[PDB]
Design a protein around this nucleic acid. Structure first.
Length: 498
RNA sequence: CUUGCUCGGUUCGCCGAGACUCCCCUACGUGCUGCU
DNA sequence: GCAGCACGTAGGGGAGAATTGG
DNA sequence: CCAATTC
């Protein structure tokens, strides 16, 4: 059974007024502010919000949070049930910590009593509620508008909101296609491919980029062009695919080419689908993020063919391998070593079902290609270039009492195990606030995923088995392991860690 | 494979290659060594 | 058990849709 | 047509 729904993001094109001023957002902020700052005793009292119209009305009357015009049950049940589950998520953290600690006590003290040693005194189990009655780790406010069935995405029509400048396609007509005869464009027009790079044009299944894409005009050292933004923006808007969400009076318009690319690169839909089918591949409950301008869609349970399993290991590993050999009688295991010169070392195998046990059939070994290593080396140079900058910036801003000590640390004795916390926390804060650090932390994940996909592809060629298994053992080692472990969660392939 | 993101090439006309599980908020922790 | 390194980690909460009632 | 119930 399919039980994983990956995301897909689209861009907002037009708004009635900023997303933060919507009554849905204001009521969400009010409810979140009231529930979080109320003691444990009164949570039970104000915890009868109910899943009905009468219950919601009484909850708002007994409390004092401004209903702000918003009075829709579908949406208030999401604003409330989320807010109380977050409140019962700071209690649950301390509860699980104290449960692990009490289980440690139940083991150790009972073992000591069996050895004649009396149990030690019980610890002061931590409380999530501070001095008077309030949560110490107060949950923050979540800026997000969680859509529902009544406000689900619909294709645009001229008799929806006439103020929209750009046109809207027919919801029933088949969707357009990008320029298919790219070699038929005359010279001097957009999209012209000059007559010297025509031979070495890729014959693969590349994704097609239109000439006005930001990737073809971004400022990079080799690009001697102009990044005039207005022309590209209007050229893009002239060919958007508008879908629209209306909540009461306000409305927001999305460009749906993101969903098109999402269904195109995964292969769930071929060219020639309508907009109704395109929205069918996604849920009618998107999530809006007012800070960026994104709208995140998730696929329906059934669109993708991933089971989203867990990395089973140990005793269950042999049972899993026996079950898979009971399936298609050709399974290719791949074994990953890491920590040996290049980041990835792999070892192919094939396993059969010889009655009860397995019969491994070695197939060889593979080393990462050279271009991938070059990309990784360039990434390492970039990361070590930003690190020596952000760490220096963190050191500079230190208080003079700590600044002098840290300066001495660079000078030439190792001491002050009390400013280490200071430099650690401020380096963490700068890392969280450094956008270049965010990009160079996303590049690590992208490159690790490139490596993992390479190994997974080449373990289907050497073994010629559609079904595969992955073995890993418990720098790039951490990110590589994290990327490899995600395969069970993301793509369904087992990860038999041993 | 029409938007968005990342890396490279250029004759600057755009083309070769990638990822697609993502969001909020909160604490300060996780590994690796050295001695008991 | 308790220091010194380095480097981000851990763990709460999210992410719909059939029906039926005026 | 569009909210409100319900699992």
């Amino acid at each position: 059974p399919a039980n994983f729904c990956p995301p897909a993001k689209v861009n907002i094109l037009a708004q009635s007024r900023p997303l933060s001023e919507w009554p849905i957002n204001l009521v969400s902020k009010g409810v979140q502010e009231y529930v979080y700052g109320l003691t444990a005793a009164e949570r039970e009292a104000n915890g009868d919000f109910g899943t009905s119209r009468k219950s919601l009305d009484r909850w708002f009357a007994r409390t004092g949070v401004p209903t702000h015009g918003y009075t829709t049950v579908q949406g208030l049940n999401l604003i409330l049930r989320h807010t109380f589950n977050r409140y019962d998520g700071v209690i649950k953290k301390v509860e699980t910590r104290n449960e692990k600690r009490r289980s440690k006590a139940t083991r150790i003290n009972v073992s000591r009593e069996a050895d004649g040693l009396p149990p030690i005194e019980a610890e002061p189990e931590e409380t999530a509620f501070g001095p008077d009655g309030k949560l110490k780790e107060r949950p923050g406010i979540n800026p997000s508008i969680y859509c529902y069935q009544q406000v689900s995405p619909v294709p645009y029509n001229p008799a929806k909101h006439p103020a929209l400048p750009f046109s809207g396609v027919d919801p029933g007509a088949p969707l357009p296609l990008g320029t298919p005869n790219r070699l038929s464009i005359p010279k001097g027009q957009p999209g012209y491919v000059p007559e010297w790079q025509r031979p070495h044009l890729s014959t693969k299944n590349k994704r097609i980029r239109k000439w006005y894409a930001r990737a073809n005009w971004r400022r990079k050292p080799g690009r001697k062009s102009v990044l005039d933004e207005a022309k590209l923006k209007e050229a893009a808007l002239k060919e958007a695919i508008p879908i629209i969400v209306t909540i009461g009076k306000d409305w927001i318009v999305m460009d749906a080419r993101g969903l098109l690319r999402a269904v195109y690169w995964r292969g769930i839909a071929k060219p020639g689908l309508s907009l109704k089918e395109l929205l069918g591949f996604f849920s009618g409950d998107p999530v809006l993020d007012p800070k960026r301008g994104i709208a995140t869609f998730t696929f329906k349970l059934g669109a993708v063919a991933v089971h989203s399993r867990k990395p089973t290991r140990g005793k269950k590993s042999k049972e899993l391998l026996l079950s898979m050999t009971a399936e298609k009688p050709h399974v290719g295991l791949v074994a990953i070593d890491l920590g040996q010169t290049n980041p990835v070392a792999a070892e192919f195998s094939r396993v059969k079902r010889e009655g009860e046990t397995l019969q491994a059939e070695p197939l060889g070994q593979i080393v990462l290609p050279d271009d991938l290593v070059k990309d990784l080396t360039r990434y390492r140079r970039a990361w070590d270039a930003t690190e020596e900058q952000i760490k220096a910036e963190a050191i500079v801003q230190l208080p003079e009492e700590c600044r002098a000590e840290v300066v001495k640390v660079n000078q030439m004795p190792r001491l002050s195990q009390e400013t280490r916390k200071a430099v650690n926390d401020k380096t963490w804060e700068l890392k969280r606030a450094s956008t270049e650090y965010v990009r160079l932390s996303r590049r690590k994940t992208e490159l690790a995923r490139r490596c993992v996909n390479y190994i997974v592809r080449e373990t289907k060629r050497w073994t010629q088995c559609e079904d595969i298994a992955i073995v890993i053992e418990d720098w790039f080692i951490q990110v590589l392991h994290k990327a490899f472990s995600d395969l069970a969660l993301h793509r369904g392939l087992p990860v038999i860690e041993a």
